[PDB]
Amino acid sequence: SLRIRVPATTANLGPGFDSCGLALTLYLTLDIGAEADSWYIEHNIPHDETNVIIETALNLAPNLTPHHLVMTCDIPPARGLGSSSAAVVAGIELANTLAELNLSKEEKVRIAAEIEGHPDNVAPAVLGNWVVGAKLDGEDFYVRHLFPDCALIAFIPKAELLPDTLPFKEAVQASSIANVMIAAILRNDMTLAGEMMERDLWPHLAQIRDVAKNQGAYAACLSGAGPTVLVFAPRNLANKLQTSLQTLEIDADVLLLDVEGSGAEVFRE
Amino acid sequence: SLRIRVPATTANLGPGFDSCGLALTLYLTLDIGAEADSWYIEHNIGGGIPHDETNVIIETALNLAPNLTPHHLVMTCDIPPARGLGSSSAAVVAGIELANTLAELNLSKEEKVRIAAEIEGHPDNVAPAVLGNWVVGAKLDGEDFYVRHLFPCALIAFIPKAELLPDTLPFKEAVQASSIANVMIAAILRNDMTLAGEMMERDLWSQLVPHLAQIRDVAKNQGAYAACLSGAGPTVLVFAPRNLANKLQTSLQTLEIDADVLLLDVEGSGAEVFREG
Amino acid sequence: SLRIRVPATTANLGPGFDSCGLALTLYLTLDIGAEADSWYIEHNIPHDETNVIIETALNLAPNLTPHHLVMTCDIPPARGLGSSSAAVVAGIELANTLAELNLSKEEKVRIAAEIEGHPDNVAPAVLGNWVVGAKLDGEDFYVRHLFPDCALIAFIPKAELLPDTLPFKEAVQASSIANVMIAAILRNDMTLAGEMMERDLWPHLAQIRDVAKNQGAYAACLSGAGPTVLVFAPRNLANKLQTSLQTLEIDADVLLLDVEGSGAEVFRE
Amino acid sequence: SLRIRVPATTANLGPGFDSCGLALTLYLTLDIGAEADSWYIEHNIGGGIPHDETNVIIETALNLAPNLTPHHLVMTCDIPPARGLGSSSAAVVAGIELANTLAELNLSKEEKVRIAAEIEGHPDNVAPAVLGNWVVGAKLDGEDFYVRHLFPCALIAFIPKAELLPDTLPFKEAVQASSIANVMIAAILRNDMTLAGEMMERDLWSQLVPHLAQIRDVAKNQGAYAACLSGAGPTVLVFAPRNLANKLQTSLQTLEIDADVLLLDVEGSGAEVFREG
Asked: What biological-process terms (Gene Ontology) are attached (chains A, C)?
């Protein structure tokens, strides 16, 4: 059967607020069954046409023949890991395929960003790897790059229970930190990048940072708006940082992740 | 004799305000002479550029090394003062190199940048003046962080005469201006100078301004990337593929704008201290 | 209908002989029709099961239900632009899809390289963009990178009508030129890279070089084993180099090409 | 006083034969004294390292500047001679810097590399000694081409005592060895030091060799990238993530191999000439 797989994404990377996004090896995967009188989705969030994926697909191609689907998703909802981004992207993939739109990837990002308000999760979800973006009156501009080899450790706690202006000088400083972070990543200088990443001028964070940084992690920052914390580290520290973070006795899932090099895929299994 | 050479720089590259800057092939050259009763600099730069201890170079030098023995010096400088090409910042860097050499401070490049940025209040002329090439920087009360990258490009400078004479930003505006500089930096590193040039032309954060659209039209219609004010102005820089440099100079010279049209390259080397006959 | 698109590739890039390959915006595209008693392919090279695509697919999945297909290919055969590579890759795509193998891309390259003897065309054809490869007793090792933005001009003449050892010192020099070429490309230093590219130590070339280099092209080298010549240039020179090369009155197609960022794709149109 | 400092280098990185090399945090330091009747270098380096005009540094200097006035000099050097860490090449570079400074030749970095490579017969110690960091080079009868990149890494050096004491290749073998260095270079630039380290360990083109497998087993089983001969040997270098440096040193010291186990870093700066008190 036709399958659609879309990865988690972390947006912001600290000072890259609303600009940088990175795709991760955690996935929303769909499995398309036969045609039918109505939309349904077998899963473990609406099971019918009201589901984001379907509303999105129907927005692109209103006349899609309904289908039954099966959905598996190891991206936790409302946790800053691009669940919602991944669902919207899947919906774009659904329609592109069933109605044979043959959309360019540049097109799928434009559509996704417009739906979402912001391009920072959806561009990497479509394109894979690391995407540096901007929305300037009307259009998206983005550049894709290959993130340096490193390990990621996702400290994923439970879902959350719940400025107008900025002084010129502080705005400037915030932009230049993002600037240096980006230049540093592009030099494979993960030490300096990590140090910029933790200076986000725009809970448990200080703890996870103290622990990870003291063993040689590059950085620990909020993924998107949170509450998951992402640790960037040398590979040889991945297992040991996981173990060390698990000791904190906080109620959380501690995962080993990589950068997902490929974006949304449609394939048969 | 002992010589100190420091390059011109163009700062505030696109929305890289107080962040991005680029060293250029114009130079402040000092030739250090004999010890003496007091400081003198021989030069013919004109304007109100002093020849004594009040010259920026010397005050900067004495600020790092108060107890220095004075010298006579000879100065060549084809970086026009107050023209947006980092004349002021080259002089500060030159004073740092003077003190560092004559008082044997053995400062690292890192310390020299830190020191020059503290003096100037921003890092984006001084870091490329010390480090060469293209520097992305941040001065964050306390310290300086910077990355040096290779800029891909020739530059055509409209250099006019010296000029005769925002408190707060909406959050969203600041976020957006940041994202444009981010994209500019990322694009440069794909060698996508077309996209970079497009980002570089947005401001978001003088005499040649009313001719900017016209300079753009002409330059970009032949394949130039962008035309921008250099730093705070008033010089305008046109960024262009290297193969286009000569023909772009000639072409822009036909506009008969009141400015010298000069061809500059990216200068890869920062400030140097060396012996030459 | 399900479509498969696979790009042209240039291998060698001079001193990167048997190691570097780059995907280009010229394509072999397949269009899969309904099932049938036998394989057939409508095209403008075998029309039946003997076709490379089909022999390859059947090698992966011997039990594929036969199909009718339509094939469009603007890659010229036997011209050093990876026609044959592209057909083999298409065949891999065919089987992966029809028999639902869900092969990883790493797998498709391994399979393709094994069929071909060498990984230098097939890896970029699968992976897209620029691939630096090696075959070391048993396995492939390759790294993908993003080739610097530039324009390509393919001087494509007609099909061709038709050492054991190397002194230590010359071998070393050849490797170090490739080394410097690669380091240069990775610094976005296309001037130095082009100058290394033209020093390949392992007809019409000298002419095309004199013409292209004298206007500011980075380089002109044989694509694969030839006879097409590829010119690498600043973008603003693309149109004018095309026009200038067309004046040579040689019997050739002069094309404007880009680096294809994406590898083989399977999609509906 | 006038000082010249030049770093150690490890060349022949993987199959980057006569091509790839890397500057390291060990130094040859010269302190230049008064003009004199003849050359003398004060030092306690041992071996047959001369103190007069026959010392490599001085012969190199006189070869660029025959008419130089002699000086007395003081030499500190913690790069062990003939140990595969570019002792010889640091001395040649130091002589170039001496002549360039005392005869005011004002040679560019490019010319200094060209000159040092011509003297040594290969560029892969001397280019990183001049340029710093990691240099990929080619010496192609006539000229030199090189690219400087940032190496990602700490190094653990097994430095033993000085050692007590192919004409042609099958085409296919040469092509393959080239492809391995190509991959090594490409992998380094993805920050994939695991893959790089794997390529770096293949030869294709002394005293510590029989312990190499053992050093590998131990180092790589804790997360090191690779263990290789440095240049022609005899020192062995272990390449490892920086966070592992200290614990790797300690760990490798338990093998009780007859060699000093030293911790080195990548040195970013090439040869420097500077004043210090």
From this structure: threonine biosynthetic process
